[PDB]
Design a protein around this ligand. Structure first.
Ligand code: MG
Ligand code: MG
Ligand code: MG
Ligand code: MG
Ligand code: MG
Ligand code: MG
Ligand code: MG
Ligand code: MG
Ligand code: MG
Ligand code: MG
Ligand code: MG
Ligand code: MG
Ligand code: MG
Ligand code: MG
Ligand code: MG
Ligand code: MG
Ligand code: MG
Ligand code: MG
Ligand code: MG
Ligand code: MG
Ligand code: MG
Ligand code: MG
Ligand code: MG
Ligand code: MG
Ligand code: MG
Ligand code: MG
Ligand code: MG
Ligand code: MG
Ligand code: MG
Ligand code: MG
Ligand code: MG
Ligand code: MG
Ligand code: MG
Ligand code: MG
Ligand code: MG
Ligand code: MG
Ligand code: MG
Ligand code: MG
Ligand code: MG
Ligand code: MG
Ligand code: MG
Ligand code: MG
Ligand code: MG
Ligand code: MG
Ligand code: MG
Ligand code: MG
Ligand code: MG
Ligand code: MG
Ligand code: MG
Ligand code: MG
Ligand code: MG
Ligand code: MG
Ligand code: MG
Ligand code: MG
Ligand code: MG
Ligand code: MG
Ligand code: MG
Ligand code: MG
Ligand code: MG
Ligand code: MG
Ligand code: MG
Ligand code: MG
Lengths: 138, 181, 111, 80, 45, 66
RNA sequence: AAUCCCCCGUGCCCAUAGCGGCGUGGAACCACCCGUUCCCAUUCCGAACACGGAAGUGAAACGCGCCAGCGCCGAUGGUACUGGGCGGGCGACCGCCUGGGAGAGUAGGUCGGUGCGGGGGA
RNA sequence: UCGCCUCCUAAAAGGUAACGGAGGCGCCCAAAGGUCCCCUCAGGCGGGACGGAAAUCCGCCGGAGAGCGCAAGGGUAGAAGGGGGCCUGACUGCGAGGCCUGCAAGCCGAGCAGGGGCGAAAGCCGGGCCUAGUGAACCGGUGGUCCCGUGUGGAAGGGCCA
RNA sequence: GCUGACUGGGGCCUGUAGAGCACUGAUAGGGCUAGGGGGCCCACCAGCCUACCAAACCCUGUCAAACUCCGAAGGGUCCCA
RNA sequence: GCCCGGAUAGCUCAGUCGGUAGAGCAGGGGAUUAAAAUCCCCGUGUCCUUGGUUCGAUUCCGAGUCCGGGCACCA
RNA sequence: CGCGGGGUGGAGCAGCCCGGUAGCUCGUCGGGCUCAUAACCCGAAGGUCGUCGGUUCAAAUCCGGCCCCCGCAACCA
RNA sequence: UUCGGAUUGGGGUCUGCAACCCGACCCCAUGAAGCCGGAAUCGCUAGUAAUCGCGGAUCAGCCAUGCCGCGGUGAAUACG
């Protein structure tokens, strides 16, 4: 689905969405990227919604990178009220300026119209990008 | 005794051959031979601690040293083995007593091994020491065959100052170690 | 293999001595000679020295040692030094090192 | 168990740490540092009790010493 | 198993712990008394 | 060597299919060895007695005369 | 005697002293080395520790150099964050002032420095 | 669920809540204690009869990832870890001065005296690497001792120390 | 009866924000490779191919209250004003 | 804390005028015309432990180990 | 959701408590007796212990997660 | 095991057009299971049962330990 195997701890505190993406952010694997303009918990099921929209969009062809991963467990109570925490029930924290997704090996006009679909499945505003000198060398 | 025929054979005619072959700026650089360590691993006597001191009596007789006993490092389930117990005898012999033992080994023991088309030459350990092991203990002259209750073999470690296998081979060859080539 | 047995026991006995905080009567002994040097730490400083080298004596290395002890006491006591602690370094207290130390009383002491 | 709550414990805080800082005047006996491992070793005129606890041996002032991979050190300087 | 050990005289003692089936013996060791100085001290009662 | 607990290890003589090995210096002097290989029977000082490989050799030999 | 240089101790800074490669040293120090009588040793072994030595060797170890492949150290500039003072946004969060200011990274650095004492040359 | 220990929450002193997130204790050891002396891990690669992923042995590499009786943390081979010899300081009489703290408790503690242990000594030694392994007081039991002893001598019963 | 909050200077203590991936874990893409998933040639040790399994290892790229090679601003405390 | 009763080869156990050890279902062997029962033979069981009593001790004195019932007590 | 019990050869049930050893009935397989089948007799085979993790030298056994099973409960409203 | 000779290695002999599949026999080597057989079950009343050898038919040869016969020695036990 997308999810770790093996966790150290089952549940973990919410924390803030403060700041800028802190890495990720420079477009390392592909010809075109999708970058986050807003912070959000992006869900294993939103990610896979986007991934499939793109493969469906081209031919089973192309190449797709993803590059954000849902390692943060997301609890919810049932309709109860208050005794303990839990349960269940996975997100990836995503700050502004991060490259998620990022396709390659496809025509610009394909990638861009697929990346546009892809971001319609996301809770945040997004930006399509290309690739650069600015994405350096390393 | 400081004489010991093999010791000699090493000094007169093994050393020079080695200097002639590899060629050596220094007297020390030419391989010496230190430490034959003999070691019997015996799970055989584990719950019986009596059987052991017979094996150490046997090892003494052929070595001329009483071995000390090795005891189990960690505890392992699958074959018995509390982390206490004696696993086997191990004797270090050097310096003369070493020699007088290797002589006997070359000229009597291995000859007495059933089959024996020769010592395996892949047992060199890559930094230039050599190891081998024997199935039965009665291939030695000091063992009378009526003093065997049960067969136990051992592991022999020939340690050498030779930095490499090649040189180490040469040393031992020249000393009369029969090799399967 | 890092940091040998020699250098462990080396440190081991120094450290213990160095806590009590006396002057240190340190002993180096080579296969040829035996030297002894009385140090005050926290100044990092040597005060009295004695060697089988600078005394140029020989024969029976132990007996040579008893002497370089008396040699140290005598020179040392001359500056007021009486109490110190025997470093013994990485050496068993025995033989040559024992001998220098039991030759280092008659003079400043407790060894 | 799992749900109701299996958690809920914690122990009392141990009020651990440094109790005298550099150049504070102390007296023989004052404990200087309260600590778990050997996190500061005893220095000049400084004792260590069986709970790893460091005290002044003498009246004086406390100096701190960072000896690199020899760890950190607390001494008391007399003029006691 | 709480431990109680007299010496020989004056029956006052000093107090110990061995909860256990060894040492199981007379359980005796040298101690200082309030009595005179440093006698033999055997376990009891 | 710790004095006690020990085999004597005194000079010896010793025997074989060969003559004596003067070397000895062993426990328990005057030992008789069954046979050695070195002394050159049985392998070294290669005798190659009794020698094998005859069984590919044979099938071709008495064969086509008959 | 100061000064310098080499060695031997022994401190200190605590890897800019490290690893690896290479080279070099035996007169003197030092080591390995000769032996196991004696003191003393090995859960077996004079390996180690110990003694009595002095024929040989700087092979090992140690010391001294030189190499930046690794390791270690590492700016300046710019950001992040932030004491204090103000704004903006439904929110998540964001910006301005003034003061403090990393981490990663880039440029580089580095094959140590040094105190006391001896021994020897100066 | 209720006392105790470890971690996080806890906002780089201490402290800090919730039917917040996770685990442990109610023991254990006459050696798992004191001292003197010695020794140094785990792992990996290579070699070695029965021996296998692992028993024991030999080589090189391996600054600690192992070990430290048990949870976790901190610590730790320049030992707190592993082996051995002597031993019982897992002493008695006290205790300068502090940590902590509403009280009462808890905790560390140099130093002096009596008599000892190990060590050539310097010295260390008032249990255990440390932080849980525990329970005011009142009632009473048992051992000792000097103290009290209802006219007096005893006894009854108390006190005091354990 | 000048010691106070506050403030200036100086020392020491700390492990948060930020960041990092050296530890503990998680983790995307690729490479190289143990064991095998056995296509099988075996059905003798063999035994090669892997657009599947894969440790470690290299390269790119990330995440963490109970991770830290690092680490501010501030905060505490003592001295002198 | 108590007193007492129970502890036996493989199981149940039955057995103290003290000098020797025992029986049924088991186990095995052997017979029994179909497969039970019923017949005939052999098992340290060191009879609940240690020191002590005399020739002798399952069985006698000092401590105990374990088990029950009915009592006790419990700051 | 909540508390309590369970999951082991084909079937039903022990063993888990107290770490090392998996047993009982039935079924199944091979022989026998019978003209034959059943009954009956003599032999045998067969479980990794729901599952994933952890503790230990060692886990059916001790601990945690998840998955099914059975039972209890769900009141003043 | 000087018991017992199954298996296997090598070497040959004879018949036969031909002995790989599938022959019998000789020699060297190899020497397996087997220490009187669970439940069960067969034969035999006298020259029988046991035990020992011999011939023949078929047939080139032969897997014959089979079958049909021949004699040597030679028991036990039947209350009922
Ligand atoms: Mg980055
Ligand atoms: Mg959401
Ligand atoms: Mg409600
Ligand atoms: Mg959108
Ligand atoms: Mg090799
Ligand atoms: Mg070598
Ligand atoms: Mg806490
Ligand atoms: Mg560093
Ligand atoms: Mg020289
Ligand atoms: Mg020379
Ligand atoms: Mg050299
Ligand atoms: Mg940097
Ligand atoms: Mg800067
Ligand atoms: Mg601000
Ligand atoms: Mg920087
Ligand atoms: Mg360097
Ligand atoms: Mg220096
Ligand atoms: Mg000089
Ligand atoms: Mg932490
Ligand atoms: Mg805090
Ligand atoms: Mg704070
Ligand atoms: Mg704080
Ligand atoms: Mg609990
Ligand atoms: Mg290893
Ligand atoms: Mg190996
Ligand atoms: Mg550790
Ligand atoms: Mg821990
Ligand atoms: Mg631990
Ligand atoms: Mg820890
Ligand atoms: Mg000890
Ligand atoms: Mg004594
Ligand atoms: Mg006080
Ligand atoms: Mg108080
Ligand atoms: Mg004290
Ligand atoms: Mg005293
Ligand atoms: Mg003494
Ligand atoms: Mg009351
Ligand atoms: Mg009372
Ligand atoms: Mg009176
Ligand atoms: Mg009266
Ligand atoms: Mg009266
Ligand atoms: Mg009274
Ligand atoms: Mg004022
Ligand atoms: Mg300040
Ligand atoms: Mg953060
Ligand atoms: Mg990491
Ligand atoms: Mg953090
Ligand atoms: Mg830095
Ligand atoms: Mg003022
Ligand atoms: Mg029956
Ligand atoms: Mg059937
Ligand atoms: Mg039937
Ligand atoms: Mg489970
Ligand atoms: Mg397991
Ligand atoms: Mg009601
Ligand atoms: Mg109602
Ligand atoms: Mg309603
Ligand atoms: Mg055929
Ligand atoms: Mg027989
Ligand atoms: Mg039969
Ligand atoms: Mg015929
Ligand atoms: Mg016939």
């Amino acid at each position: 689905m997308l999810m770790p195997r093996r966790m150290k701890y089952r549940k973990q505190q919410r924390g803030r969405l403060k700041g800028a993406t802190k890495g990720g952010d420079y477009v390392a694997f592909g010809d075109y990227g999708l970058v986050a303009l807003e912070p959000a918990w992006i869900t294993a099921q939103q990610i896979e919604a986007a991934r499939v929209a793109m493969v469906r969009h081209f031919r089973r062809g192309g190449k797709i990178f993803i590059r954000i991963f849902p390692d943060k467990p997301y609890t919810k109570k049932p309709l109860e009220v208050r005794m303990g925490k839990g349960k269940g029930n996975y997100v990836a924290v995503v700050k502004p300026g991060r490259v998620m997704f990022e396709v390659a090996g496809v025509t610009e006009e394909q990638a861009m119209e697929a990346l546009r679909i892809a971001g319609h499945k996301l809770p945040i505003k997004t930006k399509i990008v290309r690739r650069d000198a600015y994405d350096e060398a390393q | 005794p400081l004489d010991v025929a093999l010791k000699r054979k090493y000094y007169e005619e093994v050393r020079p051959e080695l200097i002639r072959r590899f060629g050596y700026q220094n007297v020390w650089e030419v391989p010496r031979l230190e430490k034959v360590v003999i070691n019997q691993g015996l799970g055989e006597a584990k719950e019986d601690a009596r059987i052991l001191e017979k094996a150490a009596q046997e090892l003494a007789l052929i070595t001329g040293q009483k071995p000390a006993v090795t005891r189990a490092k960690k505890s392992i389930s699958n074959f018995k083995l509390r982390k206490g117990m004696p696993i086997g005898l191990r004797v270090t012999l050097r310096r003369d007593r070493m020699w007088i033992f290797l002589e006997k080994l070359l000229n009597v023991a291995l000859p007495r091994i059933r089959d024996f088309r020769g010592l395996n030459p892949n047992s060199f350990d890559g930094r230039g020491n050599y190891n081998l092991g024997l199935r039965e203990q009665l291939i030695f002259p000091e063992i009378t065959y009526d003093m065997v209750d049960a067969l136990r073999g051992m592991d022999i470690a020939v340690v050498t100052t030779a930095e490499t296998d090649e040189e180490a081979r040469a040393l031992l060859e020249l000393l009369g170690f029969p090799f399967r080539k | 293999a890092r940091l040998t047995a020699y250098e462990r026991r080396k440190f081991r006995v120094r450290n213990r001595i160095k806590r009590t905080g006396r002057l240190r009567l340190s002993v180096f002994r080579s296969l040829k000679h035996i030297y002894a040097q009385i140090i005050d730490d926290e100044k990092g400083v040597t005060l009295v020295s004695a060697s089988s080298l600078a005394l140029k004596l020989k024969g029976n290395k132990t007996e040579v040692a008893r002497q370089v002890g008396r040699a140290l006491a005598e020179k040392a006591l001359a500056l007021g030094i009486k109490q110190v602690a025997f470093d013994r370094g990485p050496y068993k207290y025995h033989g040559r090192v024992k001998a220098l130390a039991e030759g280092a009383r008659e003079g400043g002491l407790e060894f | 168990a799992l749900a109701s709550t299996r958690n809920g414990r914690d122990s009392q805080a141990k009020r651990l740490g440094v109790k005298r800082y550099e150049g504070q005047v102390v007296r023989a006996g004052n404990i200087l540092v309260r600590q778990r491992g050997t996190r500061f070793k005893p220095g000049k005129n400084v004792g260590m009790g069986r709970d790893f606890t460091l005290f002044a041996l003498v009246d004086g002032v406390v100096e701190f010493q960072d000896r690199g991979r020899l760890g950190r050190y607390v001494h008391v300087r007399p003029l006691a | 198993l709480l431990l109680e050990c007299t010496e020989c005289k004056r029956r006052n003692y000093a107090t110990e712990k061995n909860k256990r089936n060894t040492p199981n013996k007379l359980e005796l060791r040298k101690y200082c008394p309030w009595c005179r100085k440093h006698t033999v001290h055997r376990e009891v009662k | 060597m710790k004095e006690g607990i020990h085999p004597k290890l005194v000079p010896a003589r010793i025997i074989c299919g060969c003559g004596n090995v003067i070397e000895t210096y062993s426990t328990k002097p005057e030992i008789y060895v069954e046979v050695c290989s070195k002394c050159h029977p049985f392998y070294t000082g290669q005798q190659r007695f009794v020698d094998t490989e005859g069984r590919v050799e044979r099938f071709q030999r008495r064969y086509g005369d008959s």
